[PDB]
């Protein structure tokens, strides 16, 4: 089934409820996917960028870690 819907409206509705957002226009759910995709796209690009120096053809959490840093989304809970 198409993974863009995999980020189902309830999956979104949960996040918005957690971001404190109360009522949600239908319209939001759609933009969320775009935003998320935009967000992920930047991240994945960078993960690949790191992966290429490592001469790898496997994506690791390290690449994501080294990436989230670069976007001001530093992440703890990975690595050695």
């Amino acid at each position: 089934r198409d993974n863009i819907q995999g980020i189902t409206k309830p999956a979104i509705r949960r996040l918005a409820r957690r971001g404190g957002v109360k009522r949600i226009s239908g319209l939001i759910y759609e933009e969320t996917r775009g935003v998320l995709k935009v967000f992920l796209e930047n991240v994945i690009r960078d993960a690949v960028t790191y992966t290429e120096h490592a001469k790898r053809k496997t994506v690791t959490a390290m690449d994501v870690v080294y990436a989230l840093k670069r976007q001001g989304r530093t992440l703890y809970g990975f690595g050695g």
């Binding site: 863009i4 995999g6 999956a11 918005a16 959490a61 992440l75």
Partner: protein
């Protein structure tokens, strides 16, 4: 009230020291593979990398919704409308 619905959900707030991922892991993992595929083939995704993305995005989207809520609140609105997301993104300057 000792009955179900009351006890668990009530206490789950306190049982929820857990950090359950809000997006379904496989539905998301498929999208990761999909967008990954959208970028390049041969990309093995370590579940760790999938988790890294998933957790970051969920908190991040919650973050986006924090701003979006503000902006709705800003406009004296409860329901967020995409204009709020946009406002938030524009102000954050977190735009491509």
């Amino acid at each position: 009230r000792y009955r179900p619905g009351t006890v668990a959900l009530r206490e789950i707030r306190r049982y929820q020291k857990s950090t359950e991922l809000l997006i379904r892991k496989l539905p998301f993992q498929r999208l990761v593979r999909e967008i990954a595929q959208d970028f390049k083939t041969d990309l093995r995704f370590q579940s760790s990398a999938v988790m890294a993305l998933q957790e970051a995005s969920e908190a991040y989207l919650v973050g986006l919704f924090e701003d979006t809520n503000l902006a709705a609140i800003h406009a004296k609105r409860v329901t967020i409308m995409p204009k709020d997301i946009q406002l938030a993104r524009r102000i954050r300057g977190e735009r491509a």
